[PDB]
Design goal:
The complex is a heterotrimer of chains A (209), B (96) and C (210). Chain A has 209 residues and is an all-beta fold. Chain A has 1 helix and 19 strands. Chain A is globular and about 60 Å long. Classes of the chains: A mainly beta (209), B alpha+beta (96), C mainly beta (210). Chain B: This is Putative zinc metalloprotease aq_1964.
Chain lengths: 209, 96, 210
Amino acid sequence: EVQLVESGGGLVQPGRSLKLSCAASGFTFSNYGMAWVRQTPTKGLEWIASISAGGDKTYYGDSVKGRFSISRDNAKTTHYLQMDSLRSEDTATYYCAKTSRVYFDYWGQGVMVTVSSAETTAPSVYPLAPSMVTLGCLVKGYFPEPVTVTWNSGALSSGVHTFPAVLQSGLYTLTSSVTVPSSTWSSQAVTCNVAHPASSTKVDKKIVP
Amino acid sequence: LKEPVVVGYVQRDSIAQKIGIKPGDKIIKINGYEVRTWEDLRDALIRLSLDGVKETTLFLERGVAMPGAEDDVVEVLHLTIKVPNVQKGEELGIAP
Amino acid sequence: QFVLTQPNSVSTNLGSTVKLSCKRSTGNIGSNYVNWYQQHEGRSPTTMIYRDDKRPDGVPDRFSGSIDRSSNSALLTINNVQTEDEADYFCHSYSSGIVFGGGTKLTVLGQPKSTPTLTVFPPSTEELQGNKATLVCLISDFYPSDVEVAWKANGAPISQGVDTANPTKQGNKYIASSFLRLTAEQWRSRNSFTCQVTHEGNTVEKSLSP
């Protein structure tokens, strides 16, 4: 069961340290080398670091000035990317990967890394209410991306439309919606679960008529 | 012909071409018999043909690994072939 | 040492075949392996083709990779293109370092038109206490992406404190949102607010009132 889970990303001030993790599972860890690849809006995919399977040697990209250092911990089947002397150019989505001799066979979900002087902003969460009926949760004025909304701890996957954010005055704002019968709403109370990882805030809001 | 087995030519409409061997492939073994030199290959093909072996696994190499994937472990190069009939003067279809 | 070159965007019709190019700058294309990755908008890249032309059992048969030696390029051929191919396709190779392509962005014409379904919500009673008001307007299930959005105060053109989102692709259809930021006192004032949306002629609108 091949999975690569990133962590340890969010917000950091220019020229400072941040350590990304990538926990692997469901394959012989010590058999395959690990990697890191970032994706900005403009540049697209751009390789950063790669460690070998044995961990005898490490390799880095040309758009890093030997600032980052890649390690691995076979004991916990995890590999790391320590990053120092960061800049606003480094702001990207950092995917970790697994090598297979000649390519990257598997990728992770990716974690957002944002380099800015502007401090983290926890979102203000607000409920939205007017056979079927549509409800929603407003996530107002946060930084940086991303945020994730589930419904009743992800019990309702039916008709869940999460809309991308808008940016104004350096603050993000989005809304996520759910569509379920009136029979459900009036009986079983509905709650949205906002989560801003950069701030580490998780917020629940009960939807009321 | 006592050099390393580095494929150059791929003969048209042959076994080697049909099963899909490319130029530059370095055959290191057949069924099994260790292949180092062309002599070892020629010998093995004849042995296998007269042994009555109609099919066998041909192991080779193609290209260098990508950086940070030197020590990676994967299947070598499991590629099953038809053995040329030496009685009918059939060739595999490779030449340096 | 080298780099790869891809079309910034391409288009094709439903059922047509398409060739996505990937041209190497320096060195021999065949000497170092070439791989192909698909990526839907806001997803992890997945392997389409590896080891030049080899496809991992799972990807549809209509996909195939090649190496055009004449142009020192790699190519991705997609037969009988489907709507599910609406994604970015990056090419990849290596040598001393590891290189990716520019990013080919495939579009699929022959997709049936869909006018937008609108959902609108008032300002929350929680928000209204803080002397603020955010009118929400959710635009879901439409095609194509091209839209224009405006807000009204008693049917009166107002683009003061409006924030519209870029229409991104969630399903086969596109979705978008838009927000009108006011004060609580301004929300009460005019007793009619509308979210007008233009989409290829047809104009759907919905309203909120205090």
